[model samples]
Target: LGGYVLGSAMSRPIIHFGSDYEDRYYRENMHRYPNQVYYRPMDEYSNQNNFVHDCVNITIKQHTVTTTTKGENFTETDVKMMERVVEQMCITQYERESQAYYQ
Candidate 1:
C-alpha cells in the first residue's frame, strides 16, 4: 500500500504556493505534463526582490528545469529553432505569477 501511495503521489506536480495566487492551476497542472512549461525566475519561495541568475527555465512536460546550462542538445544544423527553454519560461512565468501578488 505504501508503494502504491507513493507512486500516486510521485505522479503529480506539487504546487506549494497558495491557491490565492490564481495561476496555481497552470503551475501545478503544467508540471504533470511533458511538452509545455511555465517558467519562473525562481520557485514560489524565491525572494521577489532578490536578483538571481540571468534566467531560470522550467519545462513542465519535459520534467527538467535548469538554470545552470544553456542551448539545445541537437546537432548544430537543428540549432535553427531549439535553444534552452529555461530562461524564456522563467521570465514569462514570473510575469504571469507576478499578477498573483496583488491577489
Candidate 2:
C-alpha cells in the first residue's frame, strides 16, 4: 500500500512558451473527469505542446513524501543515522530532546 503516490499538484493550459499540443487538449478536455480521475499537469514543464499530463486521484495517499506537519521525507540511511544520534542523546541526558525527536 506504499511506494509512490501523487499529491494535489496540477497544471493547465496557458498562453505562454509551452507545448501547444498539450495546452489545446487540456483546454478542450478540462471538463472531463472519467472514472473519478482528473488530469494533473506537471507544473514544471506544463504547457500546451510539450507538456505531459497524468490522471490522478486526489484521495490517494502519498508515499516517499511526508504530508504530516511533523513528519518529513528522508532516506532510510539518513533515518538510521539520526535515529542513532537521538539514541545517543537520550543516554547523554538529552532525554527530552531524544524523545521529542521521534516520539
Candidate 3:
C-alpha cells in the first residue's frame, strides 16, 4: 500500500489603521508521504471598536493525503490537529500586526 501524508497552510492578515487597510499574505507547505491529498481550514476575526479597527483572515488552503489502500486516508484527529495549528498561527499573526499598527 502506497500511502502519503501532506499538508499546506496559508493566511492573509488585514490590519485597519484609521481608514486605511494593509494586506499581507503568508503560506507554507509540508509533505510526509510525497503523494496526493487535499484539505483546507478557514477562520476570520474582526474587531471594530471606538479605538481599534482590525480584521484577520486565516486559512489552510489545502492539505492532502493519498493512499493506495482502500478505506485508508486522513483521520479526524489529523484534521483537528491541523486546525488547531492554524488557529494558533492566526492568533500570533494578529497580535503581531496589532502591535505594529498601534505603535
Candidate 4:
C-alpha cells in the first residue's frame, strides 16, 4: 500500500496562443529544447504571419533555460511569466474535461 498521498506531478505547461499569428510567431522564434535564452522583440508576435509550426515539444524539461557563459539565473520576468502560463494551462485542461462531462 502507498504510504501517503503526495500530490500530482508538475508537468510542463501547454503553450496556447489566442490567434493563429501568435502561434506562428512562437514557432518561428523559440526552439523548445533551449540552446539559448529566447528573447523576442516586444511586438514581434502581435502583428501577423501564416507559416504554421508545432510550438509544443514534449521532450523539453520544465524550468530549464539556457544560461550565459558567465553564469546567470533565469530572468525574474521569465519565471513569473512561465508560472502564469502553467496555471492557465491547468485551468484550461480542467475546463476541457468539465466541458466534455457536460456534453
Best candidate (score: TM-score) = 3
**Could you give me the TM-score of model 4 versus the true structure?**
0.32
lDDT (tens digit, per residue) of candidate 3 on 1-103: 1222223333433222222221111122123212221211221223422112111111333333233243445455434444444454445544454677689
lDDT against the true structure, per candidate, is 0.33, 0.31, 0.33, 0.35
For candidate 2, report its TM-score.
0.23
Better of 1 and 2 by TM-score: 1
At residue 69, candidate 3 shows an lDDT of 41
Error of 3 at 85 (Å): 1.4
Instruction: Name the candidate that leads on lDDT.
Output: 4
Candidate 1: where is the Cα deviation over 4 Å? Answer: 1-35, 38-42, 47-73, 76-81, 84-86
TM-score ranking from best candidate downward: 3, 4, 1, 2
- TM-score: the better of candidates 1 and 4: 4
Which candidate do you rate higher for TM-score, 2 or 3?
A: 3
Model 3 TM-score relative to the real fold: 0.36
Worst 10 residues of 2 by lDDT: 50-59
lDDT of 2 at 68: 41
Worst 10 residues of 3 by lDDT: 49-58
Give the range where candidate 1 is weakest over 10 consecutive residues by summed lDDT. Answer: 1-10
TM-score of each: 0.31, 0.23, 0.36, 0.32
Which segments of candidate 3 are over 4 A away from where they belong? 1-45, 48-58, 63-73
Model 1: lDDT of residue 38:
34
Q: Predict model 1's lDDT versus the native.
A: 0.33
Q: What is the lDDT of residue 6 in candidate 1?
A: 7
